[PDB]
Amino acid sequence: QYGSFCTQLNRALTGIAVEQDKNTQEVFAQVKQIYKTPPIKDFGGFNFS
Amino acid sequence: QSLQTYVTQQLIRAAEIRASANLAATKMSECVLGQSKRVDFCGKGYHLM
Amino acid sequence: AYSNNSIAIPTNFTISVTTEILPVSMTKTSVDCTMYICGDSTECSNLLLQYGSFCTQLNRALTGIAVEQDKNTQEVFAQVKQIYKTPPIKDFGGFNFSQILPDPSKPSKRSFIEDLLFNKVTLADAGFIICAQKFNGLTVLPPLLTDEMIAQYTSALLAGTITSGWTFGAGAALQIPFAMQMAYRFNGIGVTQNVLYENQKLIANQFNSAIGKIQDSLSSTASALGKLQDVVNQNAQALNTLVKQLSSNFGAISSVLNDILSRLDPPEAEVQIDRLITGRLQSLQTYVTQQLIRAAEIRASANLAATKMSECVLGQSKRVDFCGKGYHLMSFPQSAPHGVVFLHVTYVPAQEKNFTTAPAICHDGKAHFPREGVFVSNGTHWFVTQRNFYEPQIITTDNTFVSGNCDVVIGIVNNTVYDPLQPELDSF
Amino acid sequence: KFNGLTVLPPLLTDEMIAQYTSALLAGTITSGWTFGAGAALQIPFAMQMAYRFNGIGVTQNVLYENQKLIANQFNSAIGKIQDSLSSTASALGKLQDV
Amino acid sequence: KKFLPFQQFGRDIADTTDAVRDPQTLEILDITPCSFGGVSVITPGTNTSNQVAVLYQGVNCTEVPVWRVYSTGSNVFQTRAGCLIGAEHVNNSYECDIPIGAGICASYQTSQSIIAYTMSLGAENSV
Ligand SMILES: *[C@@H]1O[C@H](CO)[C@@H](O[C@H]2O[C@H](CO)[C@@H](O)[C@H](O)[C@@H]2O)[C@H](O)[C@H]1NC(C)=O
Numbered sequence: 001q002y003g004s005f006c007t008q009l010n011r012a013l014t015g016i017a018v019e020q021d022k023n024t025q026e027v028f029a030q031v032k033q034i035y036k037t038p039p040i041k042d043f044g045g046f047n048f049s
Numbered sequence: 050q051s052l053q054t055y056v057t058q059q060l061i062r063a064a065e066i067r068a069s070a071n072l073a074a075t076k077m078s079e080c081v082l083g084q085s086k087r088v089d090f091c092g093k094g095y096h097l098m
Numbered sequence: 099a100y101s102n103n104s105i106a107i108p109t110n111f112t113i114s115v116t117t118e119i120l121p122v123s124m125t126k127t128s129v130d131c132t133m134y135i136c137g138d139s140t141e142c143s144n145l146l147l148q149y150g151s152f153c154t155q156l157n158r159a160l161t162g163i164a165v166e167q168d169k170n171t172q173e174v175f176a177q178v179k180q181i182y183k184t185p186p187i188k189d190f191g192g193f194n195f196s197q198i199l200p201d202p203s204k205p206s207k208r209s210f211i212e213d214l215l216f217n218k219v220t221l222a223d224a225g226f227i228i229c230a231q232k233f234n235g236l237t238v239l240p241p242l243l244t245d246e247m248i249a250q251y252t253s254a255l256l257a258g259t260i261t262s263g264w265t266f267g268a269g270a271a272l273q274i275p276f277a278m279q280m281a282y283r284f285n286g287i288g289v290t291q292n293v294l295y296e297n298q299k300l301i302a303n304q305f306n307s308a309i310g311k312i313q314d315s316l317s318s319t320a321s322a323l324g325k326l327q328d329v330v331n332q333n334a335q336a337l338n339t340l341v342k343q344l345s346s347n348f349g350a351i352s353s354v355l356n357d358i359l360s361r362l363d364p365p366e367a368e369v370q371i372d373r374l375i376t377g378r379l380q381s382l383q384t385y386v387t388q389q390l391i392r393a394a395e396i397r398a399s400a401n402l403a404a405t406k407m408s409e410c411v412l413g414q415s416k417r418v419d420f421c422g423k424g425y426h427l428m429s430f431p432q433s434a435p436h437g438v439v440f441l442h443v444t445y446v447p448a449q450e451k452n453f454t455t456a457p458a459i460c461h462d463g464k465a466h467f468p469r470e471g472v473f474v475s476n477g478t479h480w481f482v483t484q485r486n487f488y489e490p491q492i493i494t495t496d497n498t499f500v501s502g503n504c505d506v507v508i509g510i511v512n513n514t515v516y517d518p519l520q521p522e523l524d525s526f
Numbered sequence: 527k528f529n530g531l532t533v534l535p536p537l538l539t540d541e542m543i544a545q546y547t548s549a550l551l552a553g554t555i556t557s558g559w560t561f562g563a564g565a566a567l568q569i570p571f572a573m574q575m576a577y578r579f580n581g582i583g584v585t586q587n588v589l590y591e592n593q594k595l596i597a598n599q600f601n602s603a604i605g606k607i608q609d610s611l612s613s614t615a616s617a618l619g620k621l622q623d624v
Numbered sequence: 625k626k627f628l629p630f631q632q633f634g635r636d637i638a639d640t641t642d643a644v645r646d647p648q649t650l651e652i653l654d655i656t657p658c659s660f661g662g663v664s665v666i667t668p669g670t671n672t673s674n675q676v677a678v679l680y681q682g683v684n685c686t687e688v689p690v691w692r693v694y695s696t697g698s699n700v701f702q703t704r705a706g707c708l709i710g711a712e713h714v715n716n717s718y719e720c721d722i723p724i725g726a727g728i729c730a731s732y733q734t735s736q737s738i739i740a741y742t743m744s745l746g747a748e749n750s751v
Pocket residue numbers: 047048049
């Protein structure tokens with residue numbers, strides 16, 4: 001008899017849940033391919049190990 | 050009433066986190082994929098990488 | 099294919115145009131409190147008078163949001179204090195701006211793409227934005243800037259940009275031929291300018307084709323403007339549920355106030371009317387809170403749009419991926435219902451090759467470094483080129499400089515540097 | 527989870543995010559900034575650092591004649607970062623608080 | 625509207641009745657709520673003058689009357705934002721002073737008075 005309160009609450013929480021995935025994708029997925037380094041680590045004297 | 054309070058506070062926190070995520074995306078775009086001239090945006094000093 | 103004496107340099111380029119869509123504002127709305135909760139019933143009003151200033155708070159909140167909307171619109175669009183206009187002659191060096199400039203053949207002087215954008219957005223509900231008044235104390239207010247004034251601002255910005263460059267954002271507009279302005283724009287991203295004058299009509303053709311494909315992609319696909327559409331959707335849905343909450347019981351006997359009044363005595367109808375007013379008050383408060391949060395989101399988006407208008411359009415940006423993907427050249431604005439659309443024109447290389455490289459050249463016990471560019475070798479000879487477009491030149495003393503002897507640099511090769519004065523003195 | 531407090535799993539596992547990050551690192555150290563504007567173009571590392579030096583206003587001359595000093599300083603700084611993370615626990619506060 | 629023989633009422637998207645059938649003679653009547661809105665007072669500060677203008681927003685002022693003096697006082701000017709009373713329509717265009725809406729602004733100027741005009745975006749210039 002109180003109307004449509006629960007549907008509103010569920011809708012809000014679902015919106016938040018999707019927004020999280022949007023955030024992560026926007027931050028990390030900025031590259032189109034998957035590069036990799038050669039097995040010969042001749043980088044001029046620096047270290048990235 | 051308890052549920053209403055909970056969902057409201059969650060919405061506000063989600064907005065804050067979204068702001069942080071946008072800042073992180075901008076930093077990734079500008080400090081990593083390039084070289085920046087904005088002062089103190091990518092660390093104290095003159096930015097190299 | 100990494101290696102420590104190998105580089106790849108492009109040989110051709112491509113001009114690309116992309117779109118970006120941002121919301122700016124939403125619908126202003128006002129609500130009457132005493133009429134929504136219980137209208138036309140005086141008895142109820144006397145009961146309502148026992149809660150104080152709730153309705154005043156609700157009205158103040160909604161008014162604040164309503165004003166902030168107009169503030170947003172003026173921040174985004176009104177950034178020029180004169181109304182420029184393009185001349186009647188269209189000698190722009192080969193570029194063809196016919197599809198973004200105004201068309202006086204319409205009641206509202208909008209361009210072709212603006213018409214497409216205004217026809218793609220459709221609102222399911224009818225008459226929820228001369229009549230504007232909803233069923234129960236709900237009203238929508240008209241915005242301060244009609245849709246015919248925004249078009250004038252956009253036209254002014256476009257005309258200024260294509261007739262004066264970026265100088266109209268720092269002072270008084272100074273004219274300049276378009277080809278030379280584009281030459282400066284290339285010079286800004288590290289490519290010499292004689293690369294434009296010798297490849298001009300190719301660039302013009304690429305730009306025209308890009309605009310054509312934009313027209314097609316807008317006129318065919320339907321899901322381009324989702325960001326602008328869902329705003330309308332959310333607003334309609336919230337208003338709908340507000341109105342729909344008037345047919346619930348909340349625990350009372352009936353949802354119609356007149357039936358409670360005309361079936362019981364005043365010592366009992368009170369205990370029912372109290373339940374009803376409590377429920378409706380709670381519904382109103384929920385509505386206003388949600389509206390405040392959405393307004394915050396839209397304000398953030400409007401600030402971003404204002405920054406993009408200031409930096410991509412009125413100038414040329416160096417920030418990476420801020421003004422589109424590639425190397426920024428320029429941008430153009432367009433209006434759309436409740437938002438703005440930017441077209442970014444950018445530069446991308448193509449046709450890369452393979453060469454061997456070296457950091458320096460020991461000529462005569464001296465180390466020569468390149469002033470601006472890089473050393474390359476096509477297999478038997480050594481040239482010096484610019485980093486963003488393959489164009490080799492002889493190695494002379496005018497494009498290199500000397501520093502010290504050549505027993506400290508790692509990977510220095512021998513070769514001869516030709517002296518321009520040497521033949522002038524020897525032939526003399 | 528007892529009266530309806532369910533928690534959902536994220537769409538991207540922790541083994542995909544690491545792969546994305548490794549891709550970014552490899553691109554950066556093998557191609558410079560060229561891979562963020564088009565196709566990745568290769569260039570030795572010393573020459574890329576020379577370009578960056580020239581970018582901040584110092585002549586590239588300065589790098590080629592002090593290469594190993596810079597290499598040593600960079601390595602030592604990385605080592606110090608590793609130690610500082612391995613020692614103290616209050617470094618990641620901003621995350622834990624969430 | 626074309627009811628079926630056995631139907632009586634008519635409802636809307638939000639479940640609000642908007643059509644009825646007369647029981648004694650079988651005909652269809654459409655229902656429309658009668659007008660309402662807020663009242664707005666446009667005033668320069670009391671430091672300057674004690675004169676004001678009134679805006680009835682969202683009302684076609686063929687029925688404004690239903691203080692009364694500012695119900696037929698010195699004009700009834702119709703604008704897309706409502707009916708404006710107490711202010712005089714000019715033809716010039718200046719910068720906005722007090723925002724009324726839908727492109728109409730108002731100000732206090734010359735024997736003084738309150739004027740309502742269409743705001744101007746700026747000067748015109750050809751390069
Ligand atoms: C990069 O740093 C590593 C860090 O250890 C060094 O190589 C180490 O290799 C093992 C540990 O993996 C250790 O026992 C050695 O004594 C080295 O410290 C080195 O400075 C450098 N790596 C290479 C391959 O040169």
